[PDB]
């Protein structure tokens, strides 16, 4: 699920809440873009995954439009989804988010 976010003032509270924390910036969250969203974020539960639609969030991050973005305390910080806002697609940027990779096989591929 994903909690309101009164304003920018969250957007830094948030990320320092919890190690891993997601927040999107929807200019209409009653439109499909949002939908899928929070469906996507209800599948998991332990991230603090947060959403507004106010400009102060906006402007915050220079974001011309309406973006999804998560926030983390390892690696660079912070991230950029792009493509199309999708269920499928959610569920990947996260996990392809937070947990860098591993020690473990090479994918062998190439």
């Given at each position: 699920?994903?909690?309101?976010?009164?304003?920018?003032?969250?957007?830094?509270?948030?990320?320092?809440?919890?190690?891993?924390?997601?927040?999107?910036?929807?200019?209409?969250?009653?439109?499909?873009?949002?939908?899928?969203?929070?469906?996507?974020?209800?599948?998991?539960?332990?991230?603090?995954?947060?959403?507004?639609?106010?400009?102060?969030?906006?402007?915050?991050?220079?974001?011309?439009?309406?973006?999804?973005?998560?926030?983390?305390?390892?690696?660079?910080?912070?991230?950029?989804?792009?493509?199309?806002?999708?269920?499928?697609?959610?569920?990947?940027?996260?996990?392809?988010?937070?947990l860098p990779l591993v020690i473990?096989?090479?994918?062998?591929?190439?």
């Amino acid at each position: 699920a994903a909690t309101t976010l009164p304003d920018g003032a969250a957007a830094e509270s948030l990320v320092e809440s919890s190690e891993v924390a997601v927040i999107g910036f929807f200019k209409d969250v009653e439109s499909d873009s949002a939908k899928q969203f929070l469906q996507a974020a209800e599948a998991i539960d332990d991230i603090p995954f947060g959403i507004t639609s106010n400009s102060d969030v906006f402007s915050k991050y220079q974001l011309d439009k309406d973006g999804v973005v998560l926030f983390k305390k390892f690696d660079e910080g912070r991230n950029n989804f792009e493509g199309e806002v999708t269920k499928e697609n959610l569920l990947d940027f996260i996990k392809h988010n937070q947990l860098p990779l591993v020690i473990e096989f090479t994918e062998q591929t190439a």
